[PDB]
Amino acid sequence: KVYWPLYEVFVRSKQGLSHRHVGSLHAADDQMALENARDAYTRRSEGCSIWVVKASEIVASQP
């Protein structure tokens, strides 16, 4: 039974200038996360860039 770690998803829309964080999802690897994000968040729109990043790769500033 595979691991399904957490991924953060960032999208830059067609006419958009920068990638904006739009949510999270669990996926077995980066390619499945991309595929899922494409469906869940972009609905397969042409011209949209998607970035996926495993959560563990993000270091946040301290409140």
Q: Which residues bind its own copies (CB under 8 A)?
A: 10, 12, 18-22, 30-31, 33-34, 38, 48-54, 57-61
What's the rounded Cα separation, in Å, for the pair 30 and 26?
Answer: 10
With 0-12 / 13-18 / 19 or more C-beta atoms within 10 angstroms meaning exposed / middle / buried, residue 41 is middle
Judged by beta carbon, residue 1 or residue 53, the one nearer its own copies is 53
Contact between 6 and another protein per CB under 8 A: yes
Q: Which of 33, 25, 63, 62 is nearest to 50 (CA)?
A: 33
Give the type of residue at 18: S
Q: Which does 15 bind (CB under 5 to 8 A by kind): its own copies, another protein, none?
A: none
Given the rule CB under 8 A, which residues bind another protein? 1-4, 6, 17-18, 22-29, 31-32, 35-36, 39-40, 44, 49, 55, 60-63
